Write a protein that binds this ligand. Structure first.
Ligand code: NA
Length: 121
């Protein structure tokens, strides 16, 4: 149906916008601390601590499958990246601190993304 086509075009356009958001967030992580999953071969005890691991490569895989139906879903995944890091790592670490700076810088990007999603529909 044409109504189904129109819904698919909207999901595609949201995907486009979320790709640009993902690229902008990731630029805020030049150290690439959050680029890839924590390897269970190098923090063997990770999944005892963190129930829902998340990273930018995992988000990009979901995005390329048009797996985010709205901005809230995408934000949930970004908050997991930050929040998981702030639990596993102590305050005094480069990891905890990098997560704080990513959250702060990413707030800016996400604020305008919400306005654009709402405005374009
Ligand atoms: Na902690």
């Amino acid at each position: 149906s044409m109504e189904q086509v129109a819904m698919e075009l909207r999901l595609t356009e949201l995907t486009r916008l979320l790709r640009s958001v993902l690229d902008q967030l990731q630029d805020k992580d030049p150290a690439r601390i959050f680029a890839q999953p924590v390897s269970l071969k190098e923090v063997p005890d990770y999944l005892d601590h963190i129930k829902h691991p998340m990273d930018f490569a995992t988000m990009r895989k979901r995005l390329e499958a048009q797996g985010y139906k709205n901005l809230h879903e995408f934000e949930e995944d970004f908050d997991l990246i930050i929040d998981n890091c702030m639990k596993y790592n102590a305050r005094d670490t480069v990891f905890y601190r990098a997560a704080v700076r990513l959250r702060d810088q990413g707030g800016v990007v996400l604020r305008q993304a919400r306005r654009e999603v709402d405005s374009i529909g």
